[PDB]
Design a protein around this ligand. Sequence first.
Ligand SMILES: Cn1ccnc1Sc1cc(C(=O)Nc2nccs2)c(N)cc1F
Ligand SMILES: OC[C@H]1O[C@H](O)[C@H](O)[C@@H](O)[C@@H]1O
Ligand code: NA
Length: 448
Amino acid sequence: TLVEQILAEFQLQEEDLKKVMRRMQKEMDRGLRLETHEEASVKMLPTYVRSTPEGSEVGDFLSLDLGGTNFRVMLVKVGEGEEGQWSVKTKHQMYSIPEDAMTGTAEMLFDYISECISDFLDKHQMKHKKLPLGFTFSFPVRHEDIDKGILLNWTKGFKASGAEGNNVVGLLRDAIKRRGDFEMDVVAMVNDTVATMISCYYEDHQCEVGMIVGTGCNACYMEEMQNVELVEGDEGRMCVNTEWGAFGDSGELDEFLLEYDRLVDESSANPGQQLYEKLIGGKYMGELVRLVLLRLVDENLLFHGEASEQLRTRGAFETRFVSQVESDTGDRKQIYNILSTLGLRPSTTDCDIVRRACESVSTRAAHMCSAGLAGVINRMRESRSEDVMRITVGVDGSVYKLHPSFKERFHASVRRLTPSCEITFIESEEGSGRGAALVSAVACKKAC
Ligand SMILES: Cn1ccnc1Sc1cc(C(=O)Nc2nccs2)c(N)cc1F
Ligand SMILES: OC[C@H]1O[C@H](O)[C@H](O)[C@@H](O)[C@@H]1O
Ligand code: NA
């Protein structure tokens, strides 16, 4: 119980969740209003992706995806189905993100990107073509239009100087031209939430929400134009990028933050920012467990109070370890191997204890995240005149898709918080690639 008392600090009662939920809805409202959009922790960034303005140009598009620690480039074919347009990835390629490409400059960053876009073109005998380019850029961006927007700031660790504040599309072209080797036509730039939402739409027209729970955590949803005061017009609907990862950045979550959270935040590449996300995202989950394990050792409750060399090094406990630990069938073989690799020799009780630490940290991520989505869905519920609101949520991300029970816990908690709502969850198959392309196909009936 001494150990369970420490782990109990991660618990969240239903009331705590309803409180986080109400606060999220309140910050969402603040991010939308002209008078509070500037100081709002939840930016509610207009994406310019508007309510299905029929008219799609078919053909083959190129989709770029930057956000994860693995830059991807792919070709997707957009055609005309019954429901709407169909889409499919035909060719793809992944390029790891180099060191000097991160510490360097925004200039270099996109320089290397062009090198990858080219390589992809050569290796697929296609460098001799000019096609529409859909760019999935997973970061907070203030758009002026579907093909123009500036980077507010980096998240998830990226830190290329000379990026924040400039037209991201601009940087892309600026580098694509330092090549001549090829020429693309950037028709649209979207956030990964938006790409996932769009791709699921054609599968289920009721999907009006996109959510990511992977390295980072965020969501987007369809808003009524009259509520998007940062964009002239009251007619139609536009998708908004909440960037709820920064929820709590103005102290909204102060009463829930634990010592491990303050520690993770203080050593992060962005101290004081993305606090809500630091409670959920796979970029921080393993690190949280590591800190919890370290306190347990200093309390002399784990590993005989003797921490390994590796255990004391940041990022050693990878988020994938958390997921594997929770997949252990009960024979503790999985847990032992993982801890043995980190230079430890755990007992049966040490293993069970690491298991509990993981479940506490991941279970809190699931519930904390559920409050956010519940806030989004209930906010939308106010503008939905009907007994039972049926809505679909498009989801992607390693934490949500691969963690043994995150998904399950998350679903049950979200439903508990959304009375009068019938929520359907769908996972995207190449949500980003196909999403970016599908949006380029519509916006391309204006730029092409
Ligand atoms: C998600 N949802 C539901 C109703 N309307 C929407 S948004 C939506 C938007 C687009 C789309 O490409 N919109 C664009 N607006 C401006 C430029 S491209 C699409 N191709 C499909 C969609 F479903
Ligand atoms: O990749 C998921 C999310 O990660 C971070 O929170 C980014 O700021 C956000 O733009 C992105 O959608
Ligand atoms: Na408006």
